[PDB]
Amino acid sequence: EADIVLTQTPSSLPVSVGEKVTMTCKSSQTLLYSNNQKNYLAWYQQKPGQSPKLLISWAFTRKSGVPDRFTGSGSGTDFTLTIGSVKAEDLAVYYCQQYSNYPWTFGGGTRLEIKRGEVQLQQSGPEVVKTGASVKISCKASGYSFTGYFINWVKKNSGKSPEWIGHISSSYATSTYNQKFKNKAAFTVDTSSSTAFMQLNSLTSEDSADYYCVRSGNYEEYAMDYWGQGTSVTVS
Known part of the structure; x- marks a missing residue:
């Protein structure tokens, strides 16, 4: 099998505080595992000058502590991340990531630009x-x-x-x-x-x-x- 390619659109998203956003991640191969009906897809958030953080895995499961306003959805080859009401703190590049088959790969990311108006x-x-x-x-x-x-x-x-x-x-x-x-x-x-x-x-x-x-x-x-x-x- 060829390496799985993840394509994210749009490349950048200029929005305002309080606005609702949606961004897509398309996989060149299905990430839905027939054995367990799970999607092997995660979303990471990388804020400026900081390391990435996990937001969501299994396409829709939020990591504990991640705000409600982040919603992951989709299945197979088509996935979306929605932020119900953006804050300035959401300014970041959002990367989708597949862990279905080796090698694991990342999408090219969506740059979210926002204007005002224990494990280590x-x-x-x-x-x-x-x-x-x-x-x-x-x-x-x-x-x-x-x-x-x-x-x-x-x-x-x-x-x-x-x-x-x-x-x-x-x-x-x-x-x-x-x-x-x-x-x-x-x-x-x-x-x-x-x-x-x-x-x-x-x-x-x-x-x-x-x-x-x-x-x-x-x-x-x-x-x-x-x-x-x-x-x-x-x-x-």
Whole structure:
């Protein structure tokens, strides 16, 4: 199977406080699993200068604490996120994301522009590295049982869809990679320090980006939920 492409429209949405918005996410392959009739689709919110947050998974299930005014709906290949009455705090890029089949993929996002009228992942600091060199980013987890969860890694560049690099099982230390990054990235975990690592090798200017570690789990918690603060890598 070809990688699943998620297409989001509109690309940007200029709205006012109090206005009702809807945005779409179309999948090139159905995300409806016949076995359980669940849609393997999530919505993430990335506010300016901040890491993404999970809003909704399973197409319509809000993460606890996410306001009522966010509503996810749709099935198969066609999904929508609605905000019943927007606030300035909703200013963000909204990304849909499929976790139906590897590699996991993200849509290109919808930029929402607004006019007036305990789980934590702590990553290492920003890196400046020479071409050809390597770097190892750490991701220290707290506030939950480390081994119960996967640690995902995600690459993000200024105007592009986030890219899922892969994930590692915290219990078994076995990894799944996106083929695009299989020769670039290497995951490890350290159970005794509750810390996940990603080594990036043979660095070029194309590797310059923000990198996040992101937790994901099992069953109801299958989707990526908690993100690290991000780690900037610049290759000079």
